[PDB]
Amino acid sequence: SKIFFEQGTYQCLENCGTVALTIIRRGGDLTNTVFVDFRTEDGTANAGSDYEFTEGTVVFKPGETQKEIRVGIIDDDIFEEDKNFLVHLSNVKVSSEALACLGSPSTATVTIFDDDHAGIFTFEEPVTHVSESIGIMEVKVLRTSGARGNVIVPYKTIEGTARGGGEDFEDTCGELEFQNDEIVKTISVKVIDDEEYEKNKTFFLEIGEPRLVEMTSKEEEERRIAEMGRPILGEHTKLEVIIEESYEF
Ligand SMILES: [Ca+2]
Ligand SMILES: [Ca+2]
Ligand SMILES: [Ca+2]
């Protein structure tokens, strides 16, 4: 009798390649032979660009309340904001081999989350404490908001009350190479033991501007939003390293 959409709202990723939506019959009749016509309407997302066209008929054989439809999701590499498109149910039968009914929701809203932000690069903490022991130390550099593309993130150590050159820490410079879909990377810095106490030895580890490696009204804002999917620095671009002393014994 009543036949409608499981979830009034769906969501997916642009690279999902496709998105499954489920339809149901509530009751008011048993079985069998009910089929529902579905089709996609455009929201802020358009067919042929953000997704694929999607119309067909769904057949209900006996003893079943669950059928799924699948809409193709078009993927490219151009950063976009979130966009939506609708899927409508219509023309219920009426086997004749009845009357209505629509049911609710007869339409679903699919949200396509984009996966082309080159990422925001940041340290996890503004300050870290480490003992003189432990020699080398691992420092994670994060890529958030997106993993798309090969990004190069430069870094270096800045001498504080703690001196480098082989006194307190061993100077380190270079650039981390973030592969596509890759998120985390560690920086190794050599902390050495002093025959000497001193106090609160502080030195810094900084990351520079990231950059990626080589190889109409709507279209304009579309290309402007695209320029916002480039690699940028995050909340913490500089790490202060405090060194704890002792414990002799
Ligand atoms: Ca898209
Ligand atoms: Ca994409
Ligand atoms: Ca895209």
Residue numbers in the entry: 372 to 468, 482 to 599, 619 to 652
Paper lines:
This large loop includes two Ca2+-binding regulatory domains (CBD1 and CBD2), connected by a short linker. High-resolution NMR and crystal structures of isolated CBD1 and CBD2 domains of eukaryotic NCX revealed four Ca2+ sites (Ca1-Ca4) on CBD1 and two Ca2+ sites (CaI-CaII) on CBD2. Different lines of evidence suggest that CBD2 interacts with CBD1 to modify the equilibrium and kinetic properties of the primary Ca2+ sensor (Ca3-Ca4 sites), either in isolated CBD12 or in intact NCX.
To test this working hypothesis, we crystallized and determined the crystal structure of a two-domain CBD12 tandem from the brain splice variant (NCX1.4). In order to crystallize the tandem, we employed a previously characterized mutant, E454K. The overall structure of CBD12-E454K shows two nearly identical CBD domains, each composed of an anti-parallel β-sandwich, with root mean square deviation (r.m.s.d for 109 Cα atoms) of 1.3 Å. In agreement with the previously published crystal structure of CBD1-E454K, our structure reveals three Ca2+ ions in CBD1 that correspond to Ca2, Ca3 and Ca4 in CBD1-WT. Notably, there is no indication for bound Ca2+ ions in CBD2 of our structure. The interface involves mainly interactions of the CBD1 Ca2+ binding loops with the interdomain linker, the CBD2 flexible FG loop and the strictly conserved CBD2 BC loop. The first hydrophilic region includes a pivotal interdomain electrostatic network centered at R532 in CBD2. This arginine takes a conformation that forms bifurcated hydrogen-bonded and non-hydrogen-bonded salt-bridges with D499, D500 in CBD1 and D565 in CBD2.
